[PDB]
Structure formats: C-alpha cells, structure tokens
C-alpha cells in the first residue's frame, strides 16, 4: 500500500 504519509 501507500505509506501513512504519502501522496
């Protein structure tokens, strides 16, 4: 998945 702080 996408890391907690990603965008």
């Amino acid at each position: 998945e996408q890391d907690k702080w990603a965008s």
Partner: antibody
Amino acid sequence: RITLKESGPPLVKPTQTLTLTCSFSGFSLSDFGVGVGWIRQPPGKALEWLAIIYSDDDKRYSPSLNTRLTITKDTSKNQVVLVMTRVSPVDTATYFCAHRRGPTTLFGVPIARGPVNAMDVWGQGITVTISS
Amino acid sequence: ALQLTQSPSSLSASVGDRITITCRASQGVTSALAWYRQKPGSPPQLLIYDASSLESGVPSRFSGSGSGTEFTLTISTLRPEDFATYYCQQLHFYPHTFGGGTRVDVRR
C-alpha cells in the same frame, strides 16, 4: 535525546512464541504521527523490515510474516511489543526497534512531511537464537 | 513487491577517496528514501533522510541526491570510520524495504 532498547529471550525453541519489548525515552507514542518499527538482521545478512506502529495506533506488517506477527503499544509504559509466533531457525537474527518521526508542525499544524522519511534513531539490537 | 537494488554490492576504497553508492527502485518511491551506515557490531545509523536532507549531527562529507527510481549517496572524502556497510531504505510503499547493502572495505 531519544533512546530505544530491545529486551526479550536470547534463546528460543522452534514452534515457540517470541515476545520482544522495545522500551524507549525522549518521546511519547502519544506524540503526533510518531512511529516505532522493528527491523531484523540474520547474521551476515541484510536488514529486513518487520512492522511498525504509530501513535494513532495504525499498524502495518511485512506481508511475508503477517500471519506470525502482532505489534502493540503500551503508551503509558513507553513500550512497543512485537510478538512473533511459531518461530523456526531462520528467525535467528539480531532484532532492532527504531523511531520514526512524525511530520513537523508549526503551531500544531503539519507543514513538513520530509522528516518521516527515515527511521532516525535505533536501539542497540537484541540477538535472538532459535534452536531446540 | 517493490525491489531496491544497491550498486555495487561491494566496493574497495582508501581514506580520502570519493565514493558513490547507488540504489534503484523497481517503481517510483518519490523522495521517500533514507541512507544508513552500519559499522560492524553496531545498529545502522541514519545519514540522509527524504533522499537528500542531511541528518542532524551527520558530517557534511555525506551527501544524497535523486528521486523516483534512482538515488545516490556520495561520501566526498572517505574517513576510516566509513569502512562499513551502507543501506538504502524506501518508505513510500509498505513494506518499507531495504536494499541489499554495499560493503565498503580497505583497498589493497
């Protein structure tokens, strides 16, 4: 000053359950966006990521070990516990816990996420041998 | 999953050299990449976070650049304490992968 230290049994037998504790000081697992993760290193091998837990209590695990890992926190004792079930000899490794910064805030407003991209402080590591 | 390949896996050098270690990811990880130096018997130590930011208290000879799928760590003037193994770590996708490491040893 942030410091972390791992504790648990140095020796464990196959099929048994391994419980490792990370006790830390210098930060609280109630601080904004902070994380504590676990990484292991079999002798002579590369680092291998295991899991991480954040202060808002989101948990994530290595997909390869997901079924055998449980990570939990005890905020008031400043500890993070990682439980690995059904260990086998290949689980012998040095186990490290580590701090992960949360975003920088300005007047309690998140303004920089670059500091979360690293595990910035590590514990000395605890050597665990799995043998019957 | 995501693959992080370090190059070279091993490298020889002498005090005063400039070395550069590179790490390539199988899919883009934006700037979420960290470099560490690990000396024998010790835990890894953070050198560079977020691909290029110098970690506080880390000597200026260490430098990191790149984003996306290709990153590099360069030590401009190798000191004796730099004979060690270096690792890169990706933090964009779970699981937060580590590269295979690159061993830097005394050339002879």
